[model samples]
Target chain A: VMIDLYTAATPNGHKVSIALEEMGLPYRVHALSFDKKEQKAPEFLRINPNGRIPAIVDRDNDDFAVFESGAILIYLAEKTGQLMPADVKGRSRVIQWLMFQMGGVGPMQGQANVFFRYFPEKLQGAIDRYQHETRRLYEVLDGRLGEAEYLAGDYSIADIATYPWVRIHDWSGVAVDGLDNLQRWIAAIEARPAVQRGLLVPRR
Target chain B: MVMIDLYTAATPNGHKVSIALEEMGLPYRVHALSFDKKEQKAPEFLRINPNGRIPAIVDRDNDDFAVFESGAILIYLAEKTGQLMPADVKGRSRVIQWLMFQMGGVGPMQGQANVFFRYFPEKLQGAIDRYQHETRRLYEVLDGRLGEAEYLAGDYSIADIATYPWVRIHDWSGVAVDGLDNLQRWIAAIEARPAVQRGLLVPR
Candidate 1:
């Protein structure tokens, strides 16, 4: 059973692709063109009312469509009973870090990218605010990685959920200097062949 | 088994766990922090939540097990009681998809609007405009979803609980809810809940 992945070349998009690669799940990619605004099309809207990329339609599950990168990761983890732990406490721990990425790192770093790289006007205050906050979050991850080998009980989707965004810290203009633990964690994940492949999702 | 200890403040993220606990009828005690004093960043609280954010919980019944991040807390409570989320895989994914939509999309965009529009020392109009417009656009997406289903995830699940606190304060973010009929209806419905009402008054 192959999952149809609707994605783009974004951190969130790579999350699912990376998860699929790691989990050994079969998937096909439908790369939506941001330049063409294909993600806003009605067909994609039917699959995700939010009309965003990184959604999945599971061929094995009655063509069930799953949207939101975090949710799709959870769905795949549960479906395969891999990546995430089955125990309640272990699962919640993984989810906590996953939420931290979804709500904190992703948004702050994304905004850093917007202000630092894309915005027509240079709002120095906004750029500084987002960059500083993203660096702070990276510090938190560094502190945690110092305590454990992974974000949760073991190497899980929590790490996958965070890696794409953290890997692009320089692109967001956020510094990773002195965050030794986080840098180590990033390098370890980067060394994985599956992660290397996932970064090239929706391949050109 | 003893009740949970909820460390929270009065924010959209904080209210998420309070509302879930109230709705789930879970026994818990709230320890409201004074953000002005940096209590959240204190060492003791950091042990429970390394991020040092509000809406974290400690389950004394389970050897003082801790959970953080509002979205994860909602899932933990939902699974603990089997109340808000569905039992099946696809149904649960449906709930999670919308929950992540709130976590990754609505919460961050709207939060930035509040920061720029209300809290920032300097009035950066471009930054404010960017987030406010993005927040409204996200609202319209939620409106479209509600037009298809009564709630964010087609039931009165944790997805709604995770989102309502943010949407309820739309005016504070300077993002209008006008013309979003479905969203307004959904907002009004959730607003009328006694549990939601109680949750909003936490730390009093």
Candidate 2:
């Protein structure tokens, strides 16, 4: 079934686009304009109550809508039965790493971006707090990458969920210094053809 | 199989899994880590959670398999016991969608509010206002959802368990739920659960 991907050009958006590309899911992208606050419009709100981008409506299931980038990934994975493991342990393993990105890297780095580049006030304290925390999270990722080639058992949705966020570390001004394993993991994921295509998503 | 080993602290994220375990009637032991002493970051605990955060679990029945990230742990427990979450595809995704909302939205926003409004060494009003406002906006979204459904995802699932801990402490983050009657009703209902009451005092 065809899927409708509502998204913008952001890390979270790239996650689903990349997953759709990698999983060979046929989808049409509806690029919302953040500048116009189109994501907050009532029409889009009907599909996603949170009024956020990176939501999907699966035509295969009576136009069922799923939002929240992480949930979308899991939905797509379960639907195709492709980017996740069937076993209980392996599936939970993938989810563990996925949750890491959702709860830790995404929010922390997002705040880092806000304070470091977007906030009107020059709150050095807030900037330092978020940046330091983001870097610390990157360190955790580095440590995990040191043990496993991928975040989980294989190149599951966990890696797909994390790659977009970590690859933009430079944009958030969070450094990867001494995180050799994380750097290697990022390089490996960035080199994927599907990943390259996904990054240009909501294509103009 | 023996009881699960839950390494956690007294945080919203930590309470999510604790509440899940109680609701599922799972046998578990809590090892409360000291944030002041950095026990969470210790090498041993890091094995359980590379992120070195609270609310990690080791299932003795599964070869001491460790699962981290509160969201992931919630999914794990739900799947294991076939409790709190629905088995049907769409129903399960609904639960996951709201759970992700709590993980990526409410938890981070409220957590940042806690940092800037209560714990931060500096009194940056701008940063405080930013997070508190965003958090209130998220709460309003929840209120709107509750207005339609009895729970976040139409039932008392892990989604509700995952979110209740954060909204229950809205005042601590300096965000008021005074006008959000729907949200207040949801909160009071979840707060009345015996398992939720038992989970909050974990490690006491």
Candidate 3:
């Protein structure tokens, strides 16, 4: 089946591309530029009513549609079964980390970035609060990474879901210099050929 | 092995007890009446977590311990069984929805409620507007998805647990629900479950 990935180069969008690259799956990328508001168009909104990027349509299964970056990763992982562990316990651990990213790091950091960088109205209090919270979350990841090489058991979907967003911490203005363990883990994931390919797949 | 879950009676924290009751094939009861701020500060809750947050737990078998945030609950449940979550791609998609509920919807929105409704010496229009807007956006996302699926995932799982609390409080929070048919359907379906009904009041 030809997977049609409608995404951009943002961290959230990068999540799906990275998963596909890791899976060694054949897919087409339809890069939707948020700068141009391409995602909010009527055509794209049909696929994802939320009008968010990082949505996918599997033409192989009569074009089964999916959205939300976290969901997209799960879909691809389930299809390939390469990144996720099959054992129930192992699988739940994987899901847990993925959820951690979804609920904790991703949204928190994204908001931090928004109020800190993107929003026209710059509120120092808002920016500081979000940045501090983002730092704390990064600390959590760093503490967890200190215990293991990966977020969960081995390099599962948990790692895939989290790393891309974490990778953009500097760009988001959230500093992470003291997080030695997260830094090491990030460097390790960065070394993957699939990760590199995924990072740039839809962009270039 | 006896499972010890340290939790409170509030929405997000309360949901965990419900999930445990639904998923774990064991008998458990609430610690009861911690909202007076006494139980949370009690040495026992703090022992499980220095942070004094409810929903921390201890597993007798491995002498294992876990704590913090609703996101952790889904992870714990998924790790315990392969059932609440899907083993493959679709399952992961479902998991993401629940995680999003906690991360994007429940925590942030409810946190905003506390800020606007309870905290903040004065009502700042900007702060209230920003959080309420984001909360509404999240609800719209859930409303759109609930339009199709009977549950957040294929079958009932942590996704529903994460979402129910937020949806239940829409009216109280002054968020509209008329257009959220799918969410309403999902809310009703899960609320009707005997286990869910019982679990909500558990750990009393």
Candidate 4:
């Protein structure tokens, strides 16, 4: 199924891209102009009522529009019957790790970016807290990767959801130094041809 | 699937699990931790969730397997009972989408609203305004969606369960949902549910 994806070059956007490439789903990307606030345009809002980037309209499903990166990834996975686990328990484990990314890593790292990069003035305390929090989450991911070859038992959507954010850790000013397992996993995923191809989608 | 042990408290995230348990008619143990005494950050509960957050579960029905993150717990409960979500791929994806809407957009923004508007040691108006306004916009999105469907995903699924508790507490975060008739209607409808009433009072 081909999907019409509206996105910017962002970690969240890359999640959908990586999933689509890995799942072998054909998709067309419409890059929204951030400076123009094109995401808030009425047409885009129709696709994503939340007015966020990385939303998709599934052309094969009669223009079935889905928003939220996790949702889009899951939709793509289910549609293709790939990238996520097949059984209930295994799927739940993948969802658990995916939720960990959605609720913890994304927010913490995003906040670290905000305080350290976008805030009107440098708030050192805020910056420090978020950076340290993001680094700690990296430690948690490192610990989990230490236990298995992939998060939630295989190379599933959970890892796809997380990689884009960690790949750009330097932009958020948090170093991944000393996290050996995490670095190993990162390097492994980065070496994937499809992931490399996916990261360049809706080109900057 | 009788072995669900919920370690939670009286927070929005905590209510998510409790409500899911009640709605699914699942038998479980509820252990509320202490915030005044910092029991959540302690060892007993930390073992279940190293993040030291609530709404985590150890499903002894499956070898005392643990899952954290409110969104993950909702997915776990739904997959376990196959009740809160529909069996069809399309229906399930809708539920997952709205749940992500809450997990990533509403929950984090409203939480920041609470911190800046209520708990921050020094008042930061910019931060407060930023989050409160963002929360209001998110509520607008929910209200708009509700205007079309009876529930967030056209049924009383886990998406609604993940959202209701957070929306009910808008006042605490300095965000207003008063003028949103659709959202108000949705809230009142969910409020009257026997399961929700039972869920809110969990571990009391």
Candidate 5:
């Protein structure tokens, strides 16, 4: 399958690159520049109408385009029948945890980033609000990890979708001091050769 | 082939599943929860959804299997019924991508708008403005997509099922949907569906 991954160095962008590497797929990368607003250009918008980073054009599949990181990860997994549970029950569990990241972890941390890093005016309340909530979400994940080896057991796309964001907790000003289990899981995935390569995607 | 158990409320997340169940003509018993009683956070509900959020479902046909997260539940039901979703790889990927857009962007941002704009005890205009503007931006993306296609992913698939409820209730987030003719068109079309009207009143 020909996969042309349009991405940058953000967490969402890293998701597709990481999935491609993890799945051992060969893919070309196009690094989008937020400064130029190239993502909103007509060409890229055709691939991802949302004008977001990390869209993929699968040339092998009649030039199909897939956007949204969660969907991209699942698309790669289903394409190769790897990185996800095969059975119905197990797959649902994986989807739920994946949603845990898409719906909860990713947004909470993104808000933490906006308030703690991006906002021009230093609204300590807003910064504290998202940071506190981000930490709370980490605790929830730590609790879940305490019960199993991975988010959905067996290190599926759920962990793949989550690890990148969780790894950059410091960048978002969200502390992870006592989240021993999340820390353990983070260290375990961070040591992967594929993940390391994925993080270097678009050659910085 | 058999019924399921839907634990939900009147919120947008809950409506996604309720609407889906109605559309599939699948039988489901609803358990309306009370935040005042903290029922959603109870141990029993926690087992169903570790995140302790509403819109979880237990599939009776699958040995009481539980699935949480509105987007995941939509995918599960759609796959089981083989309705409102594509079976082919490219088509399915398109639907999943839109569903991801809703799961990751629309729901989280809109919910924050509700909190900072409505529910928070302390009035935080900066926080409220941040969320409301983001929510409107997301709606603009949806409106742009709707302008070209009759439904998201062009199938009236679970993406529409997942997103329509959220966009329909945008007022709760203080977002004015003015000038988005495409979005209004899509909203009005879905609003006339008998299944949707019925689904909006689950747990009666």
Candidate 6:
């Protein structure tokens, strides 16, 4: 079945592309540019009530549609039996991390970026707090990486999901010093051909 | 092993307890209570976590070792079966960082966003702007992160699972996610996972 991915050239959107690449599945990308406010259009909103990009329509099974980048990764992994671990414990761990990203880092750093980099009306306090918190998060990653080579089991979907954003720490104006382990891990994942290709998918 | 999970009554945090029970192949009871004025401070949950948040756990596998935070739950589960998490170091860190991102970012920002945007009696434009803008920025960060990887970590790890639900509500929160390519990709990936489809409805 053909899968239609409505996305743009952004981090979360790239997650799906990378997954599709890794999963070795064929899918179409429908780039939704926010500058054009395409996602806010009524047609796009029908696919995702949230009027967000990074939604999907899977024609294989009842034209099933889904939203949220984290959920999309799980869906593809489960369908292809490629990235996700099969055992209950392993799978649950994967879910836990996914939830963590959903509820924590993704939102926090993103906010920091906005206050620090994007928002027209800047609040120094807000920016400082978020950046500080984001850096602290990097430290936590560094500490964990200091103990284990991988987050869970093997080189699975977890790596594919996280490295890109961490890679942008400096770009996002979040400090990465003392996060040696995280830096090391990011460097390693960034070197992957799959990751590079995934970043450029559906793009010229 | 007899699994012990310490949790309070709440939405995302409480969901972890229910998810752990459903995923771990265990039978457990819920200790429901109001957290208003720190009811979680009742000495029981605090024994598991000094932070007094819901969803801490004690695994009977090795002399009742305890772990705190929802993200930690995924790590504990993965360590138990060596399944859900990736096996490599890079993969593992990716998952951990993303989880950290959630713990330190999305949850807090969304809470504030909800408060300022939905719950506040008098709309404080300043507060609303602060949270909503932060929330949107977080979405962009996620979009950027997902651009490079398949899942937050690599293979399907807990990172992706943790973040999907929250990211699914960009519109409701009035956050913009149109430009996040990678995030878009991730949304599609999780939609394909069967366990997630079922997991979302579990313990309801």
For all candidates listed, what's the TM-score of chain B alone?
0.98, 0.98, 0.82, 0.97, 0.98, 0.79
Residue A121 local lDDT, model 4: 76
| TM-score on alpha carbons, each prediction | 0.98, 0.98, 0.83, 0.96, 0.97, 0.64
Per-residue alpha-carbon lDDT of candidate 6 for residues B81-126, written as tens digits (9 for 90 to 100): 5766676644554565566556656767777787667876666577
TM-score of chain B of 6: 0.79
| Worst window of 10 by summed lDDT in candidate 6 chain A | A95-104
Two-chain DockQ for each candidate model: 0.92, 0.90, 0.37, 0.75, 0.85, 0.14
Give one digit per residue, the lDDT tens place, for model 5 in A108-196: 89988998889878888778888998888898899999999998899889998999999899899887888899889999999999899
Q: What is the overall TM-score of model 6 with all chains considered together? A: 0.64
lDDT tens digits by residue: candidate 3, B1-204: 666554556565566655655655554445554666677668766555444455555544445545455656665656555656666655666566456655655676666665665566666567667777777777777777666767767677767776776667775665666777777777788778776776666654
Candidate 2 steric clashes: 0
Which candidate model has the greater lDDT, 2 or 6?
Answer: 2
Model 4 per-residue lDDT at B158: 97
Of the two candidates 1 and 2, the one with more favorable DockQ, higher being better, is 1
For model 4 chain B, give the 10-residue run with minimal summed lDDT: B44-53
lDDT of 1 by residue, B33-137 (tens): 999999999999999999888889999888899999999989988988999999998889989998999999999999989998999999988889989999999
Q: Which candidate gets the maximum DockQ versus the true structure?
A: 1
lDDT of 2 by residue, A53-130 (tens): 899999989999999999999999999999899998889999999989998889999999998999997888888888
Candidate 2 regions with alpha-carbon error over 4 angstroms: none
Quality of candidate 6's docking, in CAPRI categories? incorrect
Q: For residues B77-195, what per-residue lDDT tens digits would candidate 4 score against the true structure?
A: 88888898998878988999999999998898898788879997777777778789989999999999999999999989999999999999998898888889999999999999999
By the DockQ metric, which is better: model 1 or model 6? Answer: 1
> Where does candidate 6 stray beyond 4 Å?
B1-3, B7-54, B59-109, B114-125, B130-204
Q: List the residue pairs that clash in candidate 3.
A: A78-B88, A78-B89, B6-B55, B7-B55, B30-B203, B30-B204, B31-B203, B32-B204, B98-B159, B146-B182
For this target, which candidate reaches the highest lDDT against the unseen true structure? 1
